[PDB]
Amino acid sequence: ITHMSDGIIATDRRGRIRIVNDMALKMLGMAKEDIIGYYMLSVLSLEDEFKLEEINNDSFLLDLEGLIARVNFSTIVQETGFVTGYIAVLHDVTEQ
Ligand SMILES: [Zn+2]
């Protein structure tokens, strides 16, 4: 489940970030101009212990000062079945 206060990142099929909201920028402590175009998993420092193909029901703890945040992933799929992209949802751990 997603909330209004969550960070959101969306990518193309190759995992490059195309959309990121201001809350995600706040949580990551980055500027948009330094995020767009780059690989999501790399931006999140999950580069090794995870890859796109594998996106699962599990939430994960993200290193962030700042916070920790918990993140869950999903795929963007067409009717043809084809995965056209990916979404990360970043939750403040003290959400509630
Ligand atoms: Zn949330």
Report the candidate in 38, 44, 53 with the shortest Cα–Cα distance to residue 86: 53
CATH number at residue 6: 3.30.450.20
Ligand 1 center from residue 81 Cα (angstroms):
27
Render 7-49 in DSSP notation, one character per residue. EEEEE-TTSBEEEE-HHHHHHHT--GGGTTTSBHHHHTT-TTT
Contact between 17 and 38 (Cβ < 8 Å): yes
Range of the structural domain that residue 3 is part of: 1-96
Experimental method: X-ray
**For residues 33 and 10, what is the distance between their CA atoms, to the nearest angstrom?**
15
Protein residues with C-beta less than 5 angstroms from the ion ligand 1? 3, 6, 91, 95
Residues in the chain that come right before a backbone break, where C and next N are over 2.5 Å apart: 55, 64
For residue 23, the one-letter residue type is: M
User: Tokens 């962030």 belong to which residue?
Assistant: 64
Which residue from 71, 51, 67 is spatially nearest to 59, judged by alpha carbons?
Answer: 71
Three-state DSSP state, 88: strand
Ligand 1 centre and the CA of 40: distance in Å? 19
CA distance 82 to 13: 9
In the chain, how many domains are there? 1
